[PDB]
Design a protein around this ligand. Sequence first.
Ligand code: PRO
Lengths: 286, 52
Amino acid sequence: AKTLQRFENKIKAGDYYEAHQTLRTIANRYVRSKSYEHAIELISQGALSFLKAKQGGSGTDLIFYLLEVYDLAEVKVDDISVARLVRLIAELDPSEPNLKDVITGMNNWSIKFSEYKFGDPYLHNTIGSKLLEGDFVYEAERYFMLGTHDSMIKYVDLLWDWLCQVDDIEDSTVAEFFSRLVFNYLFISNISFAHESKDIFLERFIEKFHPKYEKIDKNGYEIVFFEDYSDLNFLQLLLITCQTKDKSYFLNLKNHYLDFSQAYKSELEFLGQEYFNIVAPKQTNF
Amino acid sequence: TSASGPEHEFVSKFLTLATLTEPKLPKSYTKPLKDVTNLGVPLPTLKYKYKQ
Ligand code: PRO
């Protein structure tokens, strides 16, 4: 508590090298004597005030130092572990030259010390948002896809806002965005998110573009049938089809929509494998 | 109107056939993210540049 003051004195004074150097040698001593919680609090607090002071380089360096200690002390992914990283990600300038390196560092620690192949979902929720601030749209998409329920909300917004930015909208335009929710959530077998994000997205589409449609309902399932958006019908049917795991429905569906089958060739081959155990490759219709 | 009757009929019939019994995976099904091993197939890049 006492050397945190001497430190943030040196930071108000703009003595950045002294602040950095002093904190590190003091942090070393805590690591040396295996007082990891002390090093963790000192280092992360240090990183935070460099970032608040717009000293990207030194704050970034201290984030890597934190991750080094996290690794050393075998700090498991939990709420407290992750919140330190979330608090730090908040103060990162989206423009930091090593943003992606820092993100990869954080994510990689969360892979090593949890049972998630691709990292902690709650962490991914925050990383996603940062990436989007830097206009790193495709990276944000991935992290949201692998995130929490909040991430799903943010993902729909990301895609919805993007579609609205498009100057010359079209029949095939809406599907380019909508298909991304259906495919991505089908790929990770989150049927729930698939359905919920489809509903948010289609409602917004209806309320803004006033397409001609009628809701078709059978045994608690609903297709919003669009008179002018075949693509959108196909995509909704695709989701329900995967749920049934019935190869013949999958085949029927593809046989009816020959063009969409070609357009989504590789996506459909994968879904056929994941949901229907189809070993046979896609025979190319054209 | 009847210009899209053929596709309306097809969608309606397909939905009925697909939901004759409860689909193997329910709407609320979520594979635990702990068990997710891969991310499927890469999706195409969008034609549009992105701003804010
Ligand atoms: O790191 C540890 O485990 C001890 C407990 C408080 C700080 N030093």
